[PDB]
Design a binder for this molecule. Sequence first.
Ligand code: FMN
Ligand code: HBA
Length: 370
Amino acid sequence: TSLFEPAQAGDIALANRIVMAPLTRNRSPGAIPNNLNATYYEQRATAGLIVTEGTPISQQGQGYADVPGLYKREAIEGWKKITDGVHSAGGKIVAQIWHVGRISHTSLQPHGGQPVAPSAITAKSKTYIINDDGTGAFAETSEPRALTIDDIGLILEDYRSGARAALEAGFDGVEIHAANGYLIEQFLKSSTNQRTDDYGGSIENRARFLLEVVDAVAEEIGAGRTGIRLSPVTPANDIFEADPQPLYNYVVEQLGKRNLAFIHVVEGATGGPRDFKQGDKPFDYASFKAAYRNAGGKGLWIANNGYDRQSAIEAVESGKVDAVAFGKAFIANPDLVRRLKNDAPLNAPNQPTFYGGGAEGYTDYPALAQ
Ligand SMILES: Cc1cc2nc3c(=O)[nH]c(=O)nc-3n(C[C@H](O)[C@H](O)[C@H](O)COP(=O)(O)O)c2cc1C
Ligand SMILES: O=Cc1ccc(O)cc1
């Protein structure tokens, strides 16, 4: 199996196994994708699969400024232009449906309310907010409110609508964002979940919310078009779990029963060391993937974090992974696939232009000279 050869992820056919990782860019003010966003995605449409930046299912689920959502009619219309452009270049694309949970700020919340979370525990994290004078800034996340079961019922509805919106927007499917210390992970991990109801305590209970979201999304659009991103040991957004193995093995066992399109795994600290660990024992990725496969899981296995060309080729050849997702490399390289194919040099990413702004450091990264 080669990195550059076609794959299948549920009902979604991919021209190759080079994937564009989801990348929050904060360039859709008013939660609506614009013409510049459409250009940015079109440039990268040679990717076998594009996973969009995080796109929240609600304003409640928004944690960062100028992030395109799926809850406005105008946003749906804006995404349709993005998906039409990607498809015209023969690409494929899935929306990363998002809910940030406690990673948010009152200024972004409806009614300036408290961000929502399974337990009222404030993250020591930061979000990207825009001042009235336009300047972007990083600010401490706000105090969260503990969700009730009714709140949870409402969020589940927002997922159904979100998924429905993505289909209406012309997306090939969705990736459920269950990674990087956001809402779903907040339920999953012990440092964020101190609930005493059916959503707290045991592994089964902590995974309950994740599985409801998956079942809700898949019911709406098809299991064959539903994927999910996981990050077993990431320290992103002040989150921690002492026993990731039993928890995460149990999760993929359940996902293995659900005929999903893909499992997308952040290996290690998100944007950090691949060999990061939480708790006493190092995470066992082979045992993890085995739990998925052994439960019957046929989803395409997409791995991410700190991969380069050679390691990506070897990862796929060995059969450890089915496909590789690149984040920063795809920021810097619209034509990343061609460059990898021909082993051409790669542009360096400009970290100061990751978030907010305009075309600079977004749509002005050069393609190869041809
Ligand atoms: C600017 C930037 C924005 C990101 N936004 C998201 C996001 O919205 N959702 C997500 O799941 N991961 C996001 N990530 C994480 C990446 O998808 C990926 O996990 C990380 O960049 C490590 O991959 P890499 O070594 O290929 O760059 C973001 C990373 C960067 C650098
Ligand atoms: O802005 C960085 C970022 C990283 C991971 C996510 O899941 C979302 C945003």
